[PDB]
Amino acid sequence: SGPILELKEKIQPEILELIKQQRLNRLVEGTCFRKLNARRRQDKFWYCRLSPNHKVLHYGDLEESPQGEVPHDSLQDKLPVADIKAVVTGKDCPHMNKEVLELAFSILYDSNCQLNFIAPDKHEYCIWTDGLNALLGKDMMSDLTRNDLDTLLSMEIKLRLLDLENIQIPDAPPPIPKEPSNYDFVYDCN
């Protein structure tokens, strides 16, 4: 509604802030990816994680076994954020089924360097694309940001309207009367 929309616009910014924080915290935790077309004794899985300070991305191969997934890095171990020039997805990806198009994204940096990923699922795809964009000072566009926004913002609104239960909300702004003719109040402040 009119006033409710106004309230959403006022709160939306802080909610987007929480979401950015959540996405970055997730990058820091890191995720496990599965390389596309890995063969001849090459590890099929690898991982990437953002440094706790948010300046560099650490990555490397993994050992997917019934026990765990021990990560063993190679010479090429990092990709500093400050050197990131862009993030592309889908057909824009150099390494580009179709089910994979939707989960593909690449970090282009430095000269002609590129770190290509294939998200394990849609959820992780959104987490990483939103996270990288945040880092790059860009807006988070995934469907997960839209749903997280709707989830957290709707709750805040509902909490805000609790005492409006069974009470009519006018469609248009009630009339603002003329200011008082005096300010000689009966009681004190605070």
């Binding site: 309230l7 997730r26 409006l164 200011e179 005096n182 009681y187």
Partner: protein, 157 residues
Amino acid sequence: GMAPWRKADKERHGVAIYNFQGSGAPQLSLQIGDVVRIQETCGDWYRGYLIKHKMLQGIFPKSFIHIKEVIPAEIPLAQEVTTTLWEWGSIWKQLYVASKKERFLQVQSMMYDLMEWRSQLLSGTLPKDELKELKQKVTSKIDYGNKILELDLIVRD
């Protein structure tokens, strides 16, 4: 003769039915749903403060306020749910940011349930027996929730 400011008699508490953008003190801006304590009135204006921010005081139009009360047990129970929801809500956001997925979801469902039950409690549409069972489901969820979130343990009222 000008409208003098006088004590507000029966108009003690109200809720804003629209966002009121004031032009600055002495006017107190209000966001829809804000609950206020009304102390005085003069003409078409009230003077009071936000219940959840008593330091924020000033005047606002009578027209932007719906006068309510703040006795049937379901009423004070409804009030406890409101207060409980705000405390959980704060923690819920921290659960979100830290990606404590299980707890986040668990708290999310408890909040929806309580909001829905509180609405049923305030509906005055439940027969006597059902209402009693509903009140119990409400107090049990409040208490359990407060327990797992490590909040103060309430004692029946």
